[PDB]
């Protein structure tokens, strides 16, 4: 129900009852996860500016943390293109009557981040302070991790979330895809992509999907095309389907095959 | 100076609260069952009216209250409730023993700009009617004070998962508990033997260190039973003008048995919508067997969460 | 130039409590006779703290130290004031537990030396000449909420204005006792700061207070007794006192009465007797004031015992609030 | 602004590796046994040959290549190759994961620097001769992109090699992203050693070589195998004569049976000494009687530790 | 330009050993029983004499001398008693190793008020850190300019001191090498170390052990010196010394019975248990003292390793 | 411009114990003849040691430096202090240890730095002594340091650049000698790789006792405590225990360095001691023995006057066990 759930909230944010949570749609580490999170805006009224930003985009060096939590809430309104340090304030100082004015009129904004378990302790407290404005929008979180250990104590916490806002805010999971759910998703990223591929070729192409990765199909789409490009075949047939296999894997398994390397290299 | 600042609130806080607005006791000191929205709780609520008189009699001198019960057992209510019988329009102010940790304000300031929310005539106000600026409305309130005309009165402090504060804020918070005004505070645990952060070598009860402990007092909030749960979310419908049916408040007890009460009592203003998006008017019983699933809490996400990542 | 008139600002709740001793009540030859002067029982800590006094007197006490080691609740601080009361009418005492020191409103030591300026005694203390010099303070909890800076050069400018009253004939010095609850709290950082006191001439004398046996020093990796270095466990004095007995108990509960002028009946006396020994005598005191005006409004002020069992189901003890809290989570691990 | 700067690279990093001349590539999309400085590892080689149709293409859209091996699987070999089948001069640098953590300046400066080595005319020679500093930096990236538009010098994005990447810290991979997804961005092509380890600055969230995914799905994956004695004396035998030492085929297989005791590396390390040590027996080759007289002499990585952990335990009782 | 500044030497220390004459051999080289203040002990001594000929030798170059002993032997004892045999009264700074970590204080800063403590001056004798206070980077810069002129100037001498540390296992990484630089420039002090402990690791570095705390390239420009425990038959003499320094007469049996104490616990417990004994004679009318006092104090104070057992057996 | 006058500020008895070191003593045809100017056995380095120094003239080094590994007792100073001689007759060799550059009179660059200069007539690093400030006046300004920045530097490197082809000035390789490596962590190795990238950098010899430890200032573990990229462009060479006729012609050396005599039982009985507990505990007990026979004035030491020190000095390992013994006296009961 990734569409139905969806819109269960979907209709109390324009009703007005938001007010004091916001959205987390967790799930396994990238399952259309920011793609219906993007979603969401495309499925909100006329302009809602989005973003998609990291849990650990925080830990920067030209800014600072606390620079990284000025920008994006800005940016997700925006009032920050109106400003692009101390800039913010006379706009928000400036525009105290211009949204009563009536030149172009104000939106909140559809803020997500990825993956907010590569937070720390000092960073989730800066939500609750930006959150009580009545321009504070809606915002959007991910994680795939339960039980994790909170950065800056000694003290877990189940979604790497303070427990007290894990009462505070609405919880979404993105529910994985099967195998007609995969073939559909490369059919339409192969029609997209106009490649020519035989019709056995999208169904192995699922057949690594429930084992390796995801984009690991995409990744082979454009350089088997090359190989075929090779061949002038024009058509990526079963042959380059099986042999890029041995030259092109996923991490977990090689890594594993250092795994059986290391230890009789740490034996004999 | 200007003394035009009316409302200056976190109202989203207390948002969920505005039903209670009276212990239900006698006269003669025993505790009703259900008055003003408080059930249960019976060897509870005459706790809260001991300090009430204690308050009144002016010898709460040097002592502290703490609420030991675990979560979605009424810490949050009755620390509501003892700013509505001390007269209305008290100061009362919730904060999380984790919020100090801010980015850009020191342990020092983030606590006295949240100890002068609690002080009334507030203290808070009257240094955001104009913007150190503390020390110019040192004055202010001096003149009026002499004057007659505003009158001072002492609030309640409202602190929470306190087991993140650290060996420092609590000798700022154990000296500036000990003036002739400050606001009486109320601690909030669900922690038993606990490891002080600060030191990580200090272990003691309720990780609070064992200076302020035996001048602490210490008051036990038990669980609930569905029969006094069902009448917590009726209270909660008519407060927010929802019709719901009978089998709606046997269904969602439930999970309040299964997980807590906070997960529970959320899940209404969606389920009330739900019934919207049939048109319907009463929350029926597929709107309520349709939501645990499709959202989450915290307990049960982490478990299917972590499992299925496996 | 205007303070010999504000000489005591000090906390009304420290001492608002523990009044009922004046002195240690003892003899000319060193017994005591297990009920005077306020101080009641374990006479042999007694009558060894008036040597301590003794050596105090006599001009060989400098360099030693008071170290006082009992199980939490047997009345640790109890005896320290009772040096004070033995030493004259008018010494100064000021109780700092351990945790004192970690101040984030300033350093860890200049609250150490001003723990060492309120031990330091003058008649017409140190400490109070400091502080009107330096600021202008005698507010309401407007100015407990903001601080200010204390002048370090106004601290020996007194240093040089104490040059003159003292040997003048005006102002006579007199040394204090300064006190230091739960010991193992200070890191070796400032251990060192009280090697570095001790050796003055008007440096005052020094009493702690622990409740730890062996264990791991605060600052560094190595476990040694009472969270102390060695070099400083030996030039100390070290007492111990046993738990109480039940005659003791109600020894202090009906001197525990008159000062919160509470008129209590034989039936309390009993239990709060046996409660007071299963708890903590620190839960049992507390008790005696809520009780009370729970009696008021059962009408007839004299407290039975349907108070007293009453506000002890409504206020638990700590020690099982750490069962409880214990107890309920235990039942949270089982899924 | 002073276009004359000939020589600015470490030639050290590059020296070992000299005798590459080309990936051994066929026009079939197959490679050869011996062609252009490469010897064996073919789909390897072939992987790379992948590569260079999309690099020439240009669908490496925020896209980059690790390499995972074990140590001596031509890890660097690989690495120097591709900037000649990329053509005309294509700038290397290659940059070991801890050559960060100088006391001089943080581990930003390091980096960006590498990233202006990456891309004749280069950036970090640019901004040598104009001193005499992040002030500089947009008044050279302004100048050379007016002469792009005015059409003066072409500016080919070249190879990085970041070598040794389990010991890099976190707030490197999110720093490294942010020029990344450009299309002026240079190829980082890694290489590790090192598996299920801590990615460093977490300190217990583990990741497999410790790169975390937002890396782990913009990376292409290829393994290797080890060498067989067999194929490993051609590495010897074409280093021997771009090193110009004469080598009978009598001490050579001597030598390469050391190969698989000790890494690659040891074993083509002791060919300078070793000649150096024939020239004062007076000869001209060498002969079986000094690879058993070095290698009793200079010692491995491996047994050093092994002989010292074995007598230490008896000395301190 | 100021030549009395003699208000120096804080003592109180050092006040508890005021016996003590020096070292005192005879011209053979060996030890008597009983000489100058010190008294047994016949082992170590001459290890004193063999190191302290070395000195006016010069031989010493670079060189230290460590104490490997117990807790209360009389390492401070020995430590002082070879600043008498350098003559013409030597200064002699003991300090504790635990002084180094202090709040407003540089960790360097303490080591230069320790090392001026050790470098003494009609001839009056004063050290530099004297004409330290006697002008209280430069400003401990311009008093090298007083005293380099004297020397050449020919009036006041450099003679070296003793820097007896003590307890040196809590001393961190650091002030070894600022120690070990600044051990041999060409009249630094006689460096002497002690401490009680065997594999400690140096603090900072959590995994290299090490014999006694000590980086290992140091302590191999070290010599080693033991002292042993000691026997009641001989123990008896230094607490009656010491209380023959202070004019209390004691029984016998008493000193006998007090020599349990210097077996069950430590020397350092056992001389504490004098002058707040001997005053509670003149509570019962004696100036001498009998049996039942040190009977009394001894269950009316307890030391730190009786404090140690009593207390966590009544803890649970 | 003013300092020529730096002819040398050197050390003369912290290396003054390794006085009789004159050569790596090798053939032509580089062989080791096992008794020249010091040098008495180990002939399994010494002969893989005359190998490096020819790739030294031969300019073959670069990119490459020396670890010797070794027990206490086996020559892991006299090896590289032989390799100086023969090298250059007069070449800056300098002894540091790894702690030294844990000072806190500066940081772990600016001690580094000044010791990367002190291997570089005069030493690079010896310009400093008068060309940036005035130091070395009286034994109380050992106490304080005062800090040179790095802009005495660039001047004075701008002199010697182009008074290298003056033809008055001249510069010359020295050789580091990194005592205990594992000390140092992964903060001073990155600064060692732009160190040895220079054309000037001296060659490189550092010293170990250990085996796989940790890599201090992060969490992995290796051969020596040194990351593989630097064990990988190395030569490694280690060393054997002495045996007893081996310390026999050892010990004779610095007795007849010190102008004692020790009977010929009282030779053999010091070098039982000498192999009972350490290599160098039998040299600090010689000149120990050498005042005690000053007092009955017998001009040679005999055997029972060696055993009074040896009864009164211990060694490095009794004075472990005694304290443990003691130690076992405090926690059992
Ligand atoms: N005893 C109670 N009776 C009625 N409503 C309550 C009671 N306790 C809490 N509530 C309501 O349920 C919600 C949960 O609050 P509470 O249980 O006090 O905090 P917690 O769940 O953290 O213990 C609050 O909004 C409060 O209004
Ligand atoms: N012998 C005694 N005489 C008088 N009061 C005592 C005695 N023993 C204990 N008390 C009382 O017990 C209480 C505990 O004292 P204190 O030392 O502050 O606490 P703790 O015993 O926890 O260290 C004090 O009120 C003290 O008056
Ligand atoms: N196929 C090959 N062709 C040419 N040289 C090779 C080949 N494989 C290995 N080598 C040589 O072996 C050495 C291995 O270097 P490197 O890549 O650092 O080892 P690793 O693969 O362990 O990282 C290089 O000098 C390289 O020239
Ligand atoms: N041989 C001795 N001669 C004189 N005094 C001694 C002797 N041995 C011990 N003492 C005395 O006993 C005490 C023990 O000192 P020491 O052994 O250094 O241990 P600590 O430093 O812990 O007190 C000192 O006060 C010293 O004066
Ligand atoms: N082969 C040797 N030739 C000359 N002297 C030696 C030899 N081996 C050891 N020594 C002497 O033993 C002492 C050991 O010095 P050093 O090399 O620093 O210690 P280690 O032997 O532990 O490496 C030195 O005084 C040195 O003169």
Same mark, same amino acid.
């Not at chain 1, 499925?43 to 830990?59: N, V, Y």
């Not at chain 1, 100082?93 to 904004?109: F, L, T």
């Not at chain 2, 002068?116 to 600026?133: E, F, P, Q, S, Y």
């Given at each position: ?268 | ?47 809260? #009216?001991? *300090? ?9 001198? $040097?002592? /502290?209250? %703490?609420?030991? @019960? ?64 503390? #020390?110019? *409305? ?9 004057? $007659?005309? /505003?009158? %001072?009165?002492? @609030? ?84 927010? @003008? ?69």
């Amino acid at each position: 129900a990734a569409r139905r759930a969806a819109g269960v909230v979907l209709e109390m944010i324009r009703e007005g009852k938001i007010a004091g949570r916001a959205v987390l749609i967790a799930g396994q580490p990238g399952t259309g996860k920011t793609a219906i999170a993007m979603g969401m805006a495309q499925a909100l009224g006329p302009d809602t500016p989005f973003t998609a930003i990291a849990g650990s985009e925080i830990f920067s060096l030209e800014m600072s943390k606390t620079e990284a939590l000025t920008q994006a809430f800005r940016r997700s309104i925006s009032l920050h293109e109106i400003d692009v340090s101390e800039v913010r304030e006379q706009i928000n100082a400036k525009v105290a009557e211009w949204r009563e004015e009536g030149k172009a009129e104000i939106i909140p904004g559809v803020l997500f981040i990825d993956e907010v378990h590569m937070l720390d302790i000092e960073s989730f407290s800066f939500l609750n302070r930006a959150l009580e404005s009545d321009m504070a929008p809606v915002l959007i979180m991910a994680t795939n991790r339960g039980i994790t250990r909170i950065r800056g104590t000694s003290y877990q916490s189940p979604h790497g979330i303070p427990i007290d806002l894990l009462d505070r805010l609405l919880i979404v999971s993105t529910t994985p895809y099967s195998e007609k759910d995969t073939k559909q998703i490369l059919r339409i990223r192969c029609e997209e992509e106009d490649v020519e591929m035989s019709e056995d070729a999208y169904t192995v192409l699922t057949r690594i999907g429930l084992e390796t990765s995801l984009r690991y199909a995409i990744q082979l789409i454009t350089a088997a095309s090359l190989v075929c490009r090779k061949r002038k075949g024009t058509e990526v047939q079963v042959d380059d389907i099986k042999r890029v296999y041995s030259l092109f894997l996923d991490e977990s398994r090689s890594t594993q095959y250092m795994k059986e390397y290391q230890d009789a290299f740490l034996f004999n | 100076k200007i003394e035009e600042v009316k409302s200056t609130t976190k109202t989203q806080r207390i948002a969920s609260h505005s039903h209670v607005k009276g212990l239900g006791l006698d006269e003669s000191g025993l505790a009703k069952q259900a008055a003003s929205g408080l059930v249960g709780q019976e060897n509870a609520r005459e706790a809260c #009216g001991v *300090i009430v008189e204690l308050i009144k009699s002016k010898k709460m001198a $040097g002592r /502290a209250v %703490l609420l030991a @019960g675990p979560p979605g057992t009424g810490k949050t209510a009755l620390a509501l409730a003892i700013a509505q019988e001390l007269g209305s329009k008290v100061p009362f102010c919730p904060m999380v023993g984790s919020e100090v940790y801010s980015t850009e304000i020191k342990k020092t300031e983030v606590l006295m700009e949240n100890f002068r929310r609690a002080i009334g005539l507030t203290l808070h106000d009257l240094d955001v009617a104009n913007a150190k600026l503390r #020390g110019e *409305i040192n004055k202010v309130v001096n003149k009026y004070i002499d004057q $007659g005309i /505003a009158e %001072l009165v002492p @609030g309640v402090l409202f602190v929470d998962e306190v087991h993140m504060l650290d060996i420092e804020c609590f000798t700022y918070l154990h000296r500036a508990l000990e003036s002739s005004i400050a606001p009486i505070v109320i601690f909030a645990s669900n922690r038993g033997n606990c490891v002080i952060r600060g030191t990580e070598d200090i272990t003691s009860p309720h990780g609070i260190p064992l200076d302020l402990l035996d001048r602490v007092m210490i008051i036990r909030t038990m669980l609930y039973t569905p029969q006094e749960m069902k009448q917590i979310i009726k209270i909660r419908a008519q407060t927010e @003008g929802i019709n719901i049916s009978e089998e709606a408040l046997n269904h969602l007890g439930e999970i309040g048995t299964k997980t807590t009460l906070r997960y529970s009592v959320q899940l209404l203003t969606p389920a009330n919508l739900l019934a919207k998006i049939n048109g319907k008017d009463s929350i029926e019983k597929e709107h309520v067997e349709e939501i645990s699933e499709l959202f989450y809490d915290a307990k049960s996400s982490a478990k299917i969460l972590a499992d299925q990542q496996d």
